């Protein structure tokens, strides 16, 4: 408690880049926001370098050609591997072979830091990352990527504690999380709890709250958790995430 804690990621869906570039300029760059990701290899120009950007090798499409050239040429420091590879048909054995064969070079040759694939928090996700981490143990990632979605603050905390215990050798990046509660009071309550918690957990490197986009991503996420309105203005939850440390109700 001597310094504003800055470990909040701006998740910047490509539909923002498509429709409301101007909303990036309404971002508070002075608060606890310290990075930005967009699930892609390409850079969102409207950011204008106002935060570090983590490119992602999302899936198999992003391993060759121009997608790969975007990764090879990036001035940014930290690169994410696959999004939810267990749900895209990608085997731990294969993502292992890809890591050793092509992604390691981004460290050993480009001195980038690399996030593990970010798996869902369900048993299929937990067993995917468990096996992959085992296979690449001789060349491990800099960071363990995790997704968490649900209604109970105390449950996300137990999942992070659990996963930290199971994969002790590196810090955690929560590359996506949110409240799925439809009660705005519960959404705010959990977000506050987990932002403030993760802020004082030294082994949590950074955390990335989902929902800064004009339309609902799917039926699983809560309309009450949205960080942007349909006109591309920011919601109060977004104001607080990007302005308040500690954050409060």
PDB file of C-alpha atoms in Angstrom:
ATOM      1  CA  UNK A   1       0.000   0.000   0.000  1.00  0.00           C
ATOM      2  CA  UNK A   2       2.726   2.611  -1.029  1.00  0.00           C
ATOM      3  CA  UNK A   3       1.835   2.752  -4.842  1.00  0.00           C
ATOM      4  CA  UNK A   4      -1.355   2.490  -6.990  1.00  0.00           C
ATOM      5  CA  UNK A   5      -1.465  -1.293  -7.888  1.00  0.00           C
ATOM      6  CA  UNK A   6      -1.601  -1.615 -11.726  1.00  0.00           C
ATOM      7  CA  UNK A   7      -2.359  -5.150 -12.925  1.00  0.00           C
ATOM      8  CA  UNK A   8      -5.667  -4.753 -14.873  1.00  0.00           C
ATOM      9  CA  UNK A   9      -5.781  -5.786 -18.549  1.00  0.00           C
ATOM     10  CA  UNK A  10      -7.944  -3.938 -21.087  1.00  0.00           C
ATOM     11  CA  UNK A  11      -9.661  -6.732 -23.197  1.00  0.00           C
ATOM     12  CA  UNK A  12     -10.437  -4.896 -26.482  1.00  0.00           C
ATOM     13  CA  UNK A  13     -12.684  -7.076 -28.687  1.00  0.00           C
ATOM     14  CA  UNK A  14     -12.088  -6.532 -32.450  1.00  0.00           C
ATOM     15  CA  UNK A  15     -15.753  -5.247 -32.765  1.00  0.00           C
ATOM     16  CA  UNK A  16     -14.503  -2.120 -30.847  1.00  0.00           C
ATOM     17  CA  UNK A  17     -11.741  -1.758 -33.520  1.00  0.00           C
ATOM     18  CA  UNK A  18     -14.479  -2.347 -36.173  1.00  0.00           C
ATOM     19  CA  UNK A  19     -17.156   0.112 -34.901  1.00  0.00           C
ATOM     20  CA  UNK A  20     -16.056   2.490 -32.060  1.00  0.00           C
ATOM     21  CA  UNK A  21     -12.253   3.112 -32.387  1.00  0.00           C
ATOM     22  CA  UNK A  22     -13.007   6.472 -30.582  1.00  0.00           C
ATOM     23  CA  UNK A  23     -13.892   4.623 -27.297  1.00  0.00           C
ATOM     24  CA  UNK A  24     -10.180   3.781 -26.791  1.00  0.00           C
ATOM     25  CA  UNK A  25      -9.608   7.561 -26.294  1.00  0.00           C
ATOM     26  CA  UNK A  26     -12.231   7.569 -23.460  1.00  0.00           C
ATOM     27  CA  UNK A  27     -10.033   5.028 -21.571  1.00  0.00           C
ATOM     28  CA  UNK A  28      -8.397   6.239 -18.340  1.00  0.00           C
ATOM     29  CA  UNK A  29      -4.693   5.518 -18.906  1.00  0.00           C
ATOM     30  CA  UNK A  30      -3.836   6.953 -15.406  1.00  0.00           C
ATOM     31  CA  UNK A  31      -5.524   4.294 -13.274  1.00  0.00           C
ATOM     32  CA  UNK A  32      -4.801   0.603 -12.640  1.00  0.00           C
ATOM     33  CA  UNK A  33      -4.994  -0.448 -16.368  1.00  0.00           C
ATOM     34  CA  UNK A  34      -1.450  -1.616 -17.280  1.00  0.00           C
ATOM     35  CA  UNK A  35      -1.910  -3.780 -20.471  1.00  0.00           C
ATOM     36  CA  UNK A  36      -4.331  -4.616 -23.390  1.00  0.00           C
ATOM     37  CA  UNK A  37      -5.057  -7.815 -25.401  1.00  0.00           C
ATOM     38  CA  UNK A  38      -7.520  -8.455 -28.308  1.00  0.00           C
ATOM     39  CA  UNK A  39      -7.301 -12.268 -28.848  1.00  0.00           C
ATOM     40  CA  UNK A  40      -5.412 -11.576 -32.176  1.00  0.00           C
ATOM     41  CA  UNK A  41      -1.873 -11.324 -33.635  1.00  0.00           C
ATOM     42  CA  UNK A  42      -2.607  -7.814 -35.044  1.00  0.00           C
ATOM     43  CA  UNK A  43      -2.256  -4.553 -33.088  1.00  0.00           C
ATOM     44  CA  UNK A  44      -5.212  -2.250 -32.412  1.00  0.00           C
ATOM     45  CA  UNK A  45      -3.889   1.099 -33.746  1.00  0.00           C
ATOM     46  CA  UNK A  46      -6.458   3.203 -31.724  1.00  0.00           C
ATOM     47  CA  UNK A  47      -4.482   2.134 -28.550  1.00  0.00           C
ATOM     48  CA  UNK A  48      -1.631   4.437 -29.880  1.00  0.00           C
ATOM     49  CA  UNK A  49       0.869   2.556 -27.644  1.00  0.00           C
ATOM     50  CA  UNK A  50      -0.885   3.961 -24.470  1.00  0.00           C
ATOM     51  CA  UNK A  51      -0.557   0.525 -22.806  1.00  0.00           C
ATOM     52  CA  UNK A  52       1.610  -2.517 -23.526  1.00  0.00           C
ATOM     53  CA  UNK A  53      -0.259  -4.939 -25.897  1.00  0.00           C
ATOM     54  CA  UNK A  54      -0.028  -8.773 -25.651  1.00  0.00           C
ATOM     55  CA  UNK A  55      -0.510 -10.343 -29.077  1.00  0.00           C
ATOM     56  CA  UNK A  56      -2.052 -13.816 -29.076  1.00  0.00           C
ATOM     57  CA  UNK A  57      -1.462 -16.960 -31.154  1.00  0.00           C
ATOM     58  CA  UNK A  58      -5.190 -17.767 -30.764  1.00  0.00           C
ATOM     59  CA  UNK A  59      -5.482 -21.008 -32.828  1.00  0.00           C
ATOM     60  CA  UNK A  60      -3.910 -23.010 -35.707  1.00  0.00           C
ATOM     61  CA  UNK A  61      -4.671 -20.155 -38.289  1.00  0.00           C
ATOM     62  CA  UNK A  62      -2.142 -17.856 -36.427  1.00  0.00           C
ATOM     63  CA  UNK A  63       0.925 -20.178 -36.818  1.00  0.00           C
ATOM     64  CA  UNK A  64       1.910 -19.405 -40.504  1.00  0.00           C
ATOM     65  CA  UNK A  65       1.928 -16.638 -43.125  1.00  0.00           C
ATOM     66  CA  UNK A  66       0.940 -13.067 -42.245  1.00  0.00           C
ATOM     67  CA  UNK A  67      -0.561 -13.987 -38.832  1.00  0.00           C
ATOM     68  CA  UNK A  68       2.907 -15.413 -37.813  1.00  0.00           C
ATOM     69  CA  UNK A  69       4.727 -12.387 -39.396  1.00  0.00           C
ATOM     70  CA  UNK A  70       2.640 -10.189 -36.964  1.00  0.00           C
ATOM     71  CA  UNK A  71       4.092 -12.244 -34.002  1.00  0.00           C
ATOM     72  CA  UNK A  72       7.701 -12.341 -35.442  1.00  0.00           C
ATOM     73  CA  UNK A  73       7.796  -8.495 -35.871  1.00  0.00           C
ATOM     74  CA  UNK A  74       6.034  -7.274 -32.645  1.00  0.00           C
ATOM     75  CA  UNK A  75       7.921  -4.771 -30.456  1.00  0.00           C
ATOM     76  CA  UNK A  76       5.640  -5.924 -27.549  1.00  0.00           C
ATOM     77  CA  UNK A  77       7.178  -8.023 -24.728  1.00  0.00           C
ATOM     78  CA  UNK A  78       4.585 -10.761 -23.834  1.00  0.00           C
ATOM     79  CA  UNK A  79       2.754 -13.173 -26.207  1.00  0.00           C
ATOM     80  CA  UNK A  80      -0.208 -15.518 -25.325  1.00  0.00           C
ATOM     81  CA  UNK A  81      -0.400 -19.040 -26.884  1.00  0.00           C
ATOM     82  CA  UNK A  82      -3.751 -20.768 -27.721  1.00  0.00           C
ATOM     83  CA  UNK A  83      -7.211 -19.684 -26.531  1.00  0.00           C
ATOM     84  CA  UNK A  84      -9.156 -22.702 -25.061  1.00  0.00           C
ATOM     85  CA  UNK A  85      -7.291 -25.204 -27.265  1.00  0.00           C
ATOM     86  CA  UNK A  86      -9.290 -28.137 -25.650  1.00  0.00           C
ATOM     87  CA  UNK A  87     -12.461 -26.619 -27.223  1.00  0.00           C
ATOM     88  CA  UNK A  88     -10.869 -26.011 -30.696  1.00  0.00           C
ATOM     89  CA  UNK A  89      -9.730 -29.643 -31.133  1.00  0.00           C
ATOM     90  CA  UNK A  90      -6.016 -28.968 -30.351  1.00  0.00           C
ATOM     91  CA  UNK A  91      -4.268 -31.827 -28.466  1.00  0.00           C
ATOM     92  CA  UNK A  92      -1.813 -31.236 -25.575  1.00  0.00           C
ATOM     93  CA  UNK A  93       0.675 -33.479 -27.565  1.00  0.00           C
ATOM     94  CA  UNK A  94       0.273 -31.176 -30.638  1.00  0.00           C
ATOM     95  CA  UNK A  95       0.405 -27.783 -28.800  1.00  0.00           C
ATOM     96  CA  UNK A  96       3.566 -29.272 -27.149  1.00  0.00           C
ATOM     97  CA  UNK A  97       5.148 -30.106 -30.562  1.00  0.00           C
ATOM     98  CA  UNK A  98       4.159 -26.543 -31.876  1.00  0.00           C
ATOM     99  CA  UNK A  99       5.668 -24.942 -28.692  1.00  0.00           C
ATOM    100  CA  UNK A 100       9.088 -26.767 -28.978  1.00  0.00           C
ATOM    101  CA  UNK A 101       9.135 -26.425 -32.805  1.00  0.00           C
ATOM    102  CA  UNK A 102       8.114 -22.784 -33.411  1.00  0.00           C
ATOM    103  CA  UNK A 103       6.932 -20.853 -30.304  1.00  0.00           C
ATOM    104  CA  UNK A 104      10.075 -21.364 -28.053  1.00  0.00           C
ATOM    105  CA  UNK A 105      12.143 -19.467 -30.647  1.00  0.00           C
ATOM    106  CA  UNK A 106      10.113 -16.338 -29.643  1.00  0.00           C
ATOM    107  CA  UNK A 107      11.914 -16.608 -26.220  1.00  0.00           C
ATOM    108  CA  UNK A 108      15.306 -18.172 -27.029  1.00  0.00           C
ATOM    109  CA  UNK A 109      15.694 -15.952 -30.158  1.00  0.00           C
ATOM    110  CA  UNK A 110      13.291 -12.913 -29.698  1.00  0.00           C
ATOM    111  CA  UNK A 111      13.554 -12.836 -25.799  1.00  0.00           C
ATOM    112  CA  UNK A 112       9.736 -12.522 -25.545  1.00  0.00           C
ATOM    113  CA  UNK A 113       7.813 -13.861 -22.536  1.00  0.00           C
ATOM    114  CA  UNK A 114       5.157 -16.502 -23.348  1.00  0.00           C
ATOM    115  CA  UNK A 115       1.815 -17.296 -21.633  1.00  0.00           C
ATOM    116  CA  UNK A 116       0.597 -20.925 -21.666  1.00  0.00           C
ATOM    117  CA  UNK A 117      -2.622 -21.681 -23.529  1.00  0.00           C
ATOM    118  CA  UNK A 118      -5.529 -20.261 -21.508  1.00  0.00           C
ATOM    119  CA  UNK A 119      -8.019 -23.161 -20.881  1.00  0.00           C
ATOM    120  CA  UNK A 120     -11.632 -22.954 -19.466  1.00  0.00           C
ATOM    121  CA  UNK A 121     -11.876 -23.653 -15.688  1.00  0.00           C
ATOM    122  CA  UNK A 122     -14.080 -26.829 -16.267  1.00  0.00           C
ATOM    123  CA  UNK A 123     -12.567 -30.385 -15.894  1.00  0.00           C
ATOM    124  CA  UNK A 124     -11.671 -30.628 -19.684  1.00  0.00           C
ATOM    125  CA  UNK A 125      -9.720 -27.309 -19.448  1.00  0.00           C
ATOM    126  CA  UNK A 126      -8.051 -28.281 -16.093  1.00  0.00           C
ATOM    127  CA  UNK A 127      -6.884 -31.673 -17.493  1.00  0.00           C
ATOM    128  CA  UNK A 128      -5.672 -30.065 -20.836  1.00  0.00           C
ATOM    129  CA  UNK A 129      -3.340 -27.506 -19.178  1.00  0.00           C
ATOM    130  CA  UNK A 130      -2.269 -30.163 -16.574  1.00  0.00           C
ATOM    131  CA  UNK A 131      -0.984 -32.478 -19.406  1.00  0.00           C
ATOM    132  CA  UNK A 132       0.566 -29.661 -21.641  1.00  0.00           C
ATOM    133  CA  UNK A 133       2.437 -28.160 -18.630  1.00  0.00           C
ATOM    134  CA  UNK A 134       3.722 -31.697 -17.935  1.00  0.00           C
ATOM    135  CA  UNK A 135       4.901 -32.134 -21.605  1.00  0.00           C
ATOM    136  CA  UNK A 136       6.796 -28.734 -21.893  1.00  0.00           C
ATOM    137  CA  UNK A 137       8.241 -28.884 -18.323  1.00  0.00           C
ATOM    138  CA  UNK A 138      11.864 -28.742 -19.621  1.00  0.00           C
ATOM    139  CA  UNK A 139      10.912 -25.398 -21.475  1.00  0.00           C
ATOM    140  CA  UNK A 140       7.978 -24.047 -19.391  1.00  0.00           C
ATOM    141  CA  UNK A 141       6.014 -20.831 -20.148  1.00  0.00           C
ATOM    142  CA  UNK A 142       6.703 -17.544 -18.247  1.00  0.00           C
ATOM    143  CA  UNK A 143       3.030 -17.359 -17.143  1.00  0.00           C
ATOM    144  CA  UNK A 144       0.063 -19.744 -16.565  1.00  0.00           C
ATOM    145  CA  UNK A 145      -2.992 -18.390 -18.450  1.00  0.00           C
ATOM    146  CA  UNK A 146      -6.478 -19.027 -16.841  1.00  0.00           C
ATOM    147  CA  UNK A 147     -10.122 -18.204 -17.677  1.00  0.00           C
ATOM    148  CA  UNK A 148     -12.754 -18.104 -14.874  1.00  0.00           C
ATOM    149  CA  UNK A 149     -16.513 -17.299 -15.175  1.00  0.00           C
ATOM    150  CA  UNK A 150     -19.207 -17.784 -12.430  1.00  0.00           C
ATOM    151  CA  UNK A 151     -21.275 -16.203  -9.593  1.00  0.00           C
ATOM    152  CA  UNK A 152     -19.236 -16.819  -6.363  1.00  0.00           C
ATOM    153  CA  UNK A 153     -16.185 -14.633  -5.588  1.00  0.00           C
ATOM    154  CA  UNK A 154     -14.938 -17.228  -3.035  1.00  0.00           C
ATOM    155  CA  UNK A 155     -15.026 -19.868  -5.814  1.00  0.00           C
ATOM    156  CA  UNK A 156     -12.669 -17.954  -8.234  1.00  0.00           C
ATOM    157  CA  UNK A 157     -10.279 -17.410  -5.271  1.00  0.00           C
ATOM    158  CA  UNK A 158     -10.233 -21.228  -4.545  1.00  0.00           C
ATOM    159  CA  UNK A 159      -9.663 -22.038  -8.299  1.00  0.00           C
ATOM    160  CA  UNK A 160      -6.698 -19.526  -8.474  1.00  0.00           C
ATOM    161  CA  UNK A 161      -5.308 -20.924  -5.128  1.00  0.00           C
ATOM    162  CA  UNK A 162      -5.811 -24.482  -6.421  1.00  0.00           C
ATOM    163  CA  UNK A 163      -4.197 -23.859  -9.827  1.00  0.00           C
ATOM    164  CA  UNK A 164      -1.255 -21.943  -8.180  1.00  0.00           C
ATOM    165  CA  UNK A 165      -0.649 -24.996  -5.879  1.00  0.00           C
ATOM    166  CA  UNK A 166      -0.825 -27.410  -8.860  1.00  0.00           C
ATOM    167  CA  UNK A 167       1.463 -25.208 -11.137  1.00  0.00           C
ATOM    168  CA  UNK A 168       3.760 -23.471  -8.622  1.00  0.00           C
ATOM    169  CA  UNK A 169       6.760 -22.695 -10.909  1.00  0.00           C
ATOM    170  CA  UNK A 170       5.340 -19.447 -12.476  1.00  0.00           C
ATOM    171  CA  UNK A 171       2.924 -16.563 -11.914  1.00  0.00           C
ATOM    172  CA  UNK A 172      -0.722 -16.594 -13.147  1.00  0.00           C
ATOM    173  CA  UNK A 173      -2.351 -14.333 -15.778  1.00  0.00           C
ATOM    174  CA  UNK A 174      -6.164 -14.366 -15.610  1.00  0.00           C
ATOM    175  CA  UNK A 175      -6.482 -13.705 -19.376  1.00  0.00           C
ATOM    176  CA  UNK A 176     -10.345 -13.671 -19.092  1.00  0.00           C
ATOM    177  CA  UNK A 177     -12.789 -13.597 -16.120  1.00  0.00           C
ATOM    178  CA  UNK A 178     -16.152 -12.082 -15.103  1.00  0.00           C
ATOM    179  CA  UNK A 179     -19.293 -12.460 -12.979  1.00  0.00           C
ATOM    180  CA  UNK A 180     -22.038 -14.311 -14.935  1.00  0.00           C
ATOM    181  CA  UNK A 181     -24.551 -13.249 -12.181  1.00  0.00           C
ATOM    182  CA  UNK A 182     -27.627 -11.367 -13.536  1.00  0.00           C
ATOM    183  CA  UNK A 183     -27.851  -9.427 -10.245  1.00  0.00           C
ATOM    184  CA  UNK A 184     -25.855  -6.167 -10.819  1.00  0.00           C
ATOM    185  CA  UNK A 185     -25.206  -6.047  -6.987  1.00  0.00           C
ATOM    186  CA  UNK A 186     -23.615  -9.578  -7.161  1.00  0.00           C
ATOM    187  CA  UNK A 187     -21.594  -8.688 -10.324  1.00  0.00           C
ATOM    188  CA  UNK A 188     -20.158  -5.507  -8.714  1.00  0.00           C
ATOM    189  CA  UNK A 189     -19.653  -7.416  -5.425  1.00  0.00           C
ATOM    190  CA  UNK A 190     -17.615 -10.305  -6.978  1.00  0.00           C
ATOM    191  CA  UNK A 191     -15.592  -7.946  -9.356  1.00  0.00           C
ATOM    192  CA  UNK A 192     -14.617  -5.705  -6.328  1.00  0.00           C
ATOM    193  CA  UNK A 193     -13.756  -8.757  -4.186  1.00  0.00           C
ATOM    194  CA  UNK A 194     -11.566 -10.381  -6.912  1.00  0.00           C
ATOM    195  CA  UNK A 195      -9.897  -7.174  -8.239  1.00  0.00           C
ATOM    196  CA  UNK A 196      -8.916  -6.202  -4.653  1.00  0.00           C
ATOM    197  CA  UNK A 197      -7.833  -9.823  -3.837  1.00  0.00           C
ATOM    198  CA  UNK A 198      -5.734 -10.290  -7.033  1.00  0.00           C
ATOM    199  CA  UNK A 199      -4.196  -6.798  -6.468  1.00  0.00           C
ATOM    200  CA  UNK A 200      -2.700  -8.118  -3.122  1.00  0.00           C
ATOM    201  CA  UNK A 201      -1.718 -11.606  -4.481  1.00  0.00           C
ATOM    202  CA  UNK A 202       1.936 -11.199  -5.617  1.00  0.00           C
ATOM    203  CA  UNK A 203       1.698 -14.447  -7.763  1.00  0.00           C
ATOM    204  CA  UNK A 204      -1.120 -12.879  -9.875  1.00  0.00           C
ATOM    205  CA  UNK A 205       0.751 -10.956 -12.569  1.00  0.00           C
ATOM    206  CA  UNK A 206      -2.366  -9.493 -14.266  1.00  0.00           C
ATOM    207  CA  UNK A 207      -6.121 -10.065 -14.715  1.00  0.00           C
ATOM    208  CA  UNK A 208      -8.440  -9.231 -17.612  1.00  0.00           C
ATOM    209  CA  UNK A 209     -12.154  -8.482 -16.965  1.00  0.00           C
ATOM    210  CA  UNK A 210     -14.422  -9.536 -19.872  1.00  0.00           C
ATOM    211  CA  UNK A 211     -17.296  -7.482 -21.315  1.00  0.00           C
ATOM    212  CA  UNK A 212     -15.973  -4.200 -22.938  1.00  0.00           C
ATOM    213  CA  UNK A 213     -17.940  -4.568 -26.245  1.00  0.00           C
ATOM    214  CA  UNK A 214     -21.320  -3.212 -27.528  1.00  0.00           C
ATOM    215  CA  UNK A 215     -23.168  -6.616 -27.999  1.00  0.00           C
ATOM    216  CA  UNK A 216     -23.317  -9.676 -25.620  1.00  0.00           C
ATOM    217  CA  UNK A 217     -20.538 -12.102 -26.693  1.00  0.00           C
ATOM    218  CA  UNK A 218     -22.880 -15.122 -26.162  1.00  0.00           C
ATOM    219  CA  UNK A 219     -25.732 -16.285 -23.841  1.00  0.00           C
ATOM    220  CA  UNK A 220     -23.248 -17.414 -21.074  1.00  0.00           C
ATOM    221  CA  UNK A 221     -22.029 -13.849 -20.108  1.00  0.00           C
ATOM    222  CA  UNK A 222     -24.265 -11.505 -18.008  1.00  0.00           C
ATOM    223  CA  UNK A 223     -25.771  -8.354 -19.554  1.00  0.00           C
ATOM    224  CA  UNK A 224     -25.173  -6.887 -16.033  1.00  0.00           C
ATOM    225  CA  UNK A 225     -21.349  -7.508 -16.421  1.00  0.00           C
ATOM    226  CA  UNK A 226     -21.111  -5.413 -19.672  1.00  0.00           C
ATOM    227  CA  UNK A 227     -18.286  -2.808 -19.486  1.00  0.00           C
ATOM    228  CA  UNK A 228     -19.588  -0.932 -22.607  1.00  0.00           C
ATOM    229  CA  UNK A 229     -23.183   0.229 -23.502  1.00  0.00           C
ATOM    230  CA  UNK A 230     -24.759  -0.407 -26.958  1.00  0.00           C
ATOM    231  CA  UNK A 231     -23.654   3.176 -28.006  1.00  0.00           C
ATOM    232  CA  UNK A 232     -20.007   2.257 -27.025  1.00  0.00           C
ATOM    233  CA  UNK A 233     -19.943   4.491 -23.877  1.00  0.00           C
ATOM    234  CA  UNK A 234     -18.478   2.904 -20.686  1.00  0.00           C
ATOM    235  CA  UNK A 235     -20.648   1.449 -17.894  1.00  0.00           C
ATOM    236  CA  UNK A 236     -20.144   2.231 -14.196  1.00  0.00           C
ATOM    237  CA  UNK A 237     -18.559  -1.217 -13.684  1.00  0.00           C
ATOM    238  CA  UNK A 238     -15.987  -0.233 -16.394  1.00  0.00           C
ATOM    239  CA  UNK A 239     -15.413   3.227 -14.806  1.00  0.00           C
ATOM    240  CA  UNK A 240     -14.574   1.473 -11.508  1.00  0.00           C
ATOM    241  CA  UNK A 241     -12.330  -1.250 -13.010  1.00  0.00           C
ATOM    242  CA  UNK A 242     -10.204   1.394 -14.820  1.00  0.00           C
ATOM    243  CA  UNK A 243     -10.382   4.184 -12.099  1.00  0.00           C
ATOM    244  CA  UNK A 244     -10.534   2.686  -8.544  1.00  0.00           C
ATOM    245  CA  UNK A 245      -7.678   0.985  -6.541  1.00  0.00           C
ATOM    246  CA  UNK A 246      -8.891  -0.306  -4.196  1.00  0.00           C
ATOM    247  CA  UNK A 247     -12.141  -0.813  -6.047  1.00  0.00           C
ATOM    248  CA  UNK A 248     -15.425  -0.597  -4.034  1.00  0.00           C
ATOM    249  CA  UNK A 249     -19.223  -0.976  -4.500  1.00  0.00           C
TER     250      UNK A 249
END
